[PDB]
Paper text:
Promoter-proximal pausing also employs the negative elongation factor ([name]), which comprises the four subunits [name], -B, -C (or its variant -D, which lacks nine N-terminal amino acid residues), and -E. [name] was identified as a complex that cooperates with DSIF to repress Pol II elongation. Here we show that regions of human [name] and [name]-C form a highly conserved core subcomplex with a novel fold. One side of this [name]-AC subcomplex exhibits a conserved binding face for single-stranded nucleic acids.
Bacterial co-expression of [name] subunit variants revealed that the N-terminal region of [name] could be co-purified with [name]-C. Limited proteolysis and co-expression analysis with truncated protein variants showed that the N-terminal residues 6–188 of human [name] and residues 183–590 of human [name]-C formed a stable subcomplex (‘[name]-AC’). The structure of human [name]-AC reveals a novel fold and an extended interface between the two [name] subunits. The C-terminal half of [name]-C (helices α14’-α19’) forms three HEAT repeats (H1-H3). Two invariant tryptophan side chains (W24 and W89) on the [name] N-terminal domain insert into largely conserved hydrophobic pockets of [name]-C. [name] helices α7 and α8 are buried in the [name]-C horseshoe. Analysis of the surface of the [name]-AC structure showed that the face opposite of where we detected [name]-BE crosslinks contains four positively charged patches (bottom view).
Author numbering:
A (entry chain A), B (entry chain A), C (entry chain A): 6 to 182
D (entry chain B), E (entry chain B), F (entry chain B): 186 to 401, 404 to 444, 449 to 522, 524 to 563, 573 to 590
Write the structure that this text describes.
Amino acid sequence: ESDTGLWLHNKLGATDELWAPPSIASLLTAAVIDNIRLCFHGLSSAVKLKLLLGTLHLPRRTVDEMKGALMEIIQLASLDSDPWVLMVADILKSFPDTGSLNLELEEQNPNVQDILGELREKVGECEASAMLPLECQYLNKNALTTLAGPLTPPVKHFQLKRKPKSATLRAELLQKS
Amino acid sequence: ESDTGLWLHNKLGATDELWAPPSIASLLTAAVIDNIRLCFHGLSSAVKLKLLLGTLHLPRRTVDEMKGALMEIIQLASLDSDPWVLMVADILKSFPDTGSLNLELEEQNPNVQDILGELREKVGECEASAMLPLECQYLNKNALTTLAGPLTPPVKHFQLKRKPKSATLRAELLQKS
Amino acid sequence: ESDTGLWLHNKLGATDELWAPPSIASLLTAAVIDNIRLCFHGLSSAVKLKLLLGTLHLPRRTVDEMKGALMEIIQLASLDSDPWVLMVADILKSFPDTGSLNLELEEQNPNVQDILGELREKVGECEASAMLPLECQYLNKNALTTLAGPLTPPVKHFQLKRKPKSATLRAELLQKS
Amino acid sequence: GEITSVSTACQQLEVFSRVLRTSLATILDGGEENLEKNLPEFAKMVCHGEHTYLFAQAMMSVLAQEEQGGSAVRRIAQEVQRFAQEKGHDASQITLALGTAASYPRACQALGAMLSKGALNPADITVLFKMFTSMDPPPVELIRVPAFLDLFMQSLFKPGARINQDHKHKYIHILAYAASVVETWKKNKRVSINKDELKSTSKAVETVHNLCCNENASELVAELSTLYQCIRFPVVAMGVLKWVDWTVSEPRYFQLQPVHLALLDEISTCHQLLHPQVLQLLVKLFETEHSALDVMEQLELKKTLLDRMVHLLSRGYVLPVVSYIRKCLEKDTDISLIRYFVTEVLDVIAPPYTSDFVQLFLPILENDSIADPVTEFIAHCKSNFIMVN
Amino acid sequence: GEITSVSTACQQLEVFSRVLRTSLATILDGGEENLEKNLPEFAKMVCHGEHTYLFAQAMMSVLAQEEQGGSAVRRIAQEVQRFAQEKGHDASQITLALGTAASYPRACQALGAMLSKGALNPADITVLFKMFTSMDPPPVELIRVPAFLDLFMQSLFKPGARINQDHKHKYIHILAYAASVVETWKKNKRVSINKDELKSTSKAVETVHNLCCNENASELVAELSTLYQCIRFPVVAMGVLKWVDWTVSEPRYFQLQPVHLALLDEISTCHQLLHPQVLQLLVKLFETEHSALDVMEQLELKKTLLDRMVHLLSRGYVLPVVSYIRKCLEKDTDISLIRYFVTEVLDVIAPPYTSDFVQLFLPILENDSIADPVTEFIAHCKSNFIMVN
Amino acid sequence: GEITSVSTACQQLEVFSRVLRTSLATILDGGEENLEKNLPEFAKMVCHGEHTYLFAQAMMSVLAQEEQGGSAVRRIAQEVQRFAQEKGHDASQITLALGTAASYPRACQALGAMLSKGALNPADITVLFKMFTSMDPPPVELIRVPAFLDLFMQSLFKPGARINQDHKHKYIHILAYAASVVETWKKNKRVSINKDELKSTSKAVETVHNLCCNENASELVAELSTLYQCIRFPVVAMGVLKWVDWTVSEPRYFQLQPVHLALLDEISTCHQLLHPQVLQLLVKLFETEHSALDVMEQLELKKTLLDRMVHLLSRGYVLPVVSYIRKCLEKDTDISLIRYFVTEVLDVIAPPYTSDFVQLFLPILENDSIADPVTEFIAHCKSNFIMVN
Ligand SMILES: [Cl-]
Ligand SMILES: [Cl-]
Ligand SMILES: [Cl-]
Ligand SMILES: [Cl-]
Ligand SMILES: [Cl-]
Ligand SMILES: [Cl-]
């Protein structure tokens, strides 16, 4: 295709959109993928970030076909000048072959090293009665305990001398039947 | 006495009371003192702290009689596991022989060393016009100066142009007679 | 003159005045200047500070005549005990010969070294859009740019959709004629 | 104190990384209580672009691997995933690639479809159902995605709803499977699958589902004993809570003589994990402008909502409840309502108190202190507590 | 900012030690002025148990040995000893074992008895009296215990009181001995005893004692010149201050046409060490709810109490006085009373002012600044003072 | 927070030096916006005595030599020199000895005389004039002293004034010379002198000078087009600003039906360096107690002064303008006037906004938020901005 890089600008160059546009799977033709290695150097970061993230929205069948071409692009992105493009290229390098993202990201990456360094220590400081994930709210005790361990009982901030007014209300509504 | 340690629990085990109970001098029989070395290991800290402090409430005559037994108990307390029992045992070790408390408390005692270390420096920082003890308020100038030195005069925050309204009131009440 | 130092006290000893009194040029007779080297040691700092600053208020003709006597006094002041007298003596030492103050003041002078040290760094931190001197407000663009360089344009905090109400007011007053 | 535009914070990776580090630190400090405040400031940045969303979620997945407290980050990640969903962003492709969901082709396909559309369809539900009925079913952790389970809530307990009777058992089974089934693993190998609680849980859900969709509810009070027994199943309690929400939150509801709110007391008593949602609902109904209600009716209704808070408080969710009453006092609500909360709470509590409770309940006591258990509480605090530093 | 229970702070010696260190630091920082605030937070902890009281008092005795400022800690220890007394705790056994009081058997015995009972009895008073009359009397520092001297105040100057005439001279002598006698020591050996002022001081106390117990006082004004001369003795001034206190503080007193308050001006003029007690009394009477008094009578009475403060202020106790007027202004008292204090103070003061005074008197001036010496003071301050940092 | 007397701060050189260091730091931090606040606290200290003034000015001259930002210190020094002048202190001798002005005997003599007297006299004006007409004129930087140029303002544009017609061209020429002439230097040697703009600038000043002294102005509107063209010369704009100031600021002026204020909009549009003076004037007229004006007339007049601020704001002087409106809102001005400023500003601005603007304009928006562009602005801010730390 003639000026295939100019055409990518008219499709993904929209600064307003920062997420995958509707029908992004149809925009990424197999032939287009093979044309990206020809015009990548001149592309802006915004378009590259839409391009790279676009590979996640492709069906497993379409990805496996041009996985060689995808590896070539992701490699190109790992040699980019934009730090955002570099970071994304490091997360997707495991995708075209495994279908899963890379979570080994500390190798020669000061940002990641500084993030994980500081927060791993912070996460360990708040292990006492730490908030659980949302799925735990849907689980029976045995599934809950298997997954997250025993729940810490509520702190006793006082001692109940008598039962509240809501205790009498339960007995009433049970008597009505 | 059979189960003399159980009996001490029913007399001093009250968690509510943290000071010497009324008629503590009658509870500490000379024979009981000789029974404390037999059951001390099982006693709680609370009871031991009531026991050790109890020796101060005994008349000088009663203390001097079993001073050997008292030394034995205070020694036992200096080998206790509770830091409170240890601290009290170090203050009373001078008592059964001299009738006075020990104020040499820095030897291998990090707490005391940290307290006195920080505060000795703080006390010296506020030597300028430092507040005097209460007895000084009752003393004539010569006794006051002998004991605490010359008083620092009040800071002059302004200059009096005229005498206040209270000056005229003194002259009036002196004229009435 | 007999007790010429006592006479200087009755003329400049006023603690209320801390600036050059009116007609200070008439108080500093040429003969008086030659008498200052005789009575300087007993003078107070206040009077010396009025004396030294007084040399600035003398006409260029009067200064050049006793410049040798002035150098002698300024030297005496540079050996004074008062830090204020010393600082002033270091600023005026260049005056009787050049008519200009000394701005080389860092030599063995901890105060000046600490002032300039800290502030030179502070001045460089606020070079971005730094406030200009007052004379710049009176200058045409070409003189302004020659002297202080191009002005930094105002930060654009928003974008004008329409012109304000004051724009219509200008057109009206132009139509009245 | 300082404010920042989203665009600026995302343009430089270095800058974005630093804000992520402090924001995450704050959220972990705020606990689940201050989660609702500390979250949007972080989520807005992260959801600026798909690439920003990717990076932040990759960082959070790595932190979630920490045995000690990593679960708290998984919670944060899920809260952000919900933010993206509610703002029209599709983050299903990233979510599935983020975990080991992609290891199972058929299931991951059907699960991503529904997560992308944001609803449950019989086509993708059947695909999941057949697989979990076979001799070798996929890992249960796969269907335990918050975004997925919520789709069941609005499909089974929402006033309505559009559903196929020939597929209803499939919807119920998959939900009950996610809620009760327990797997055992050794060296990433699944040894056994425990389904003992699948039958009773599936029945509990089916029972309450039939009650909720029916409505008119005036028949609710008659089957209350059955309803309370089912609420003991957490998955069912979530459903009832959501159902009570949609029922009461909808305008033109307060024209009746309320059993819907009474069920909340049973929810609170049985499930501590649902306390912040119960309170979140109670404060949503407490801040609604009921223009159709009479002034006296508005007062008593708010007193009723406070009665739920006092009950919740008595179940051990006290500090976040006490904290809210102090917030609307210092900043609106009439004095009579605040005094009622104080009265009712002081009528059921007794020493010993913690310093954390006193530090919140004593200040609210001495703002307009005219109302004796009040002064007696103050006397206790003055005798037994000390300010430091 | 943070609050802590007493029990928790005392359970661990490590924790108790740390709070002691910061509390003592704060009290030493607050000076005698902020003593009344910073003390109870420390005292409540220390007086939790006898063992906690022992440890803290042992620490304070060691600090009191410092030549430079150690006296300030002895003051703190005595303030805490009083706290224990007022809370029903007996700390006489510890107090005597704490010093060199135990070195003298007979005297220490009698002194501990009365300190434990909290009153003076003729039996133990005679034992002390005979010893201080002999050729070899015990150290005067022994009877110079604040807790002891106070027992004399409520026995000699309190409205009443129960006392034996055959023992009265013994009570007077011991008090006058503690107040006037001066010993000289060399290498812990007492060289001489100076009793020159014992005769006149004993007479001063006896004179005012007879006046105070008499009352009706309407005879007070007649013997005012004698009364003023005696007030010059600090021990007597303390007595008059306490007597004026018990007289005025007792309800149903303000039905007369006040000489009792006028004596306070003489106290202030003679004794700077009594200024914080004079003010403490004046603010106690300024905050009393006189329900029996007429509104206009309440206003003028408060103006009268302010006249005492302005006099006290003019004696060099200005900063704590100015500080109190600012506290009740920012936080109650009607505007007219605050304006009267400003008017009277500005009518007698003049430059130079210290920055410490301006920092307190200028803010109180410009809150509701409508009342010229006021604007002239502001003009002076604006010209001569500078804010830093 | 802490206050200090001027005397104390100046007695010790060590102490004075430290305050100088922090004061100068603060003023450099406050920028030109907060200059009017941070200056007097420093100036009062520096102007305590001639020796203190000398030391501080010597320190500031050395700092002014820094190529990067040294000009900002020269500004501070000139602000202090003005403070000394306004307090009756003569600092002309120091000012001239401070620079290279003393290098030119005749001129420096005449320049110091007028700077000491504080006015312009024909004698010393002629001496300067003849020298700048000769083939070898002195450096133009010599007549570019703020204190000097101001003397021209009150002599040429002040309502009046006392001036000689035979000398008027000399006054005009010297001013126009200081404003337009451009010299080139190489190794402290003056290569050329550019006078191209001297003719047109001199004419601009002469034209407006004749208009201002005339008055009655009712003839102002007729020659408005000529007047606007001249205002483009900064030296003339300064004159008009000062003239408008003296005209309007003088009491008993608001009895007319205002062209004087309308000229300010043209000043603002042409000269960014005059924005802080334009605002300084506008806030001076906004805080004047017009006792002769009717209530409705006072309201509309203040609305008129606000119209000038909105225009000024639209010229890129927004942050200091927005800041002032927030100050009088949080601390006086009636609500209607504040709402008008908000309305007018929101009617002409649009995204993108900076965080610095939002941080000031959003708080002023949500104090009494009842008035849609307002809520739409809040919606934008909530969507696009984030709080950090
Ligand atoms: Cl549970
Ligand atoms: Cl407690
Ligand atoms: Cl005294
Ligand atoms: Cl002063
Ligand atoms: Cl310009
Ligand atoms: Cl924006």
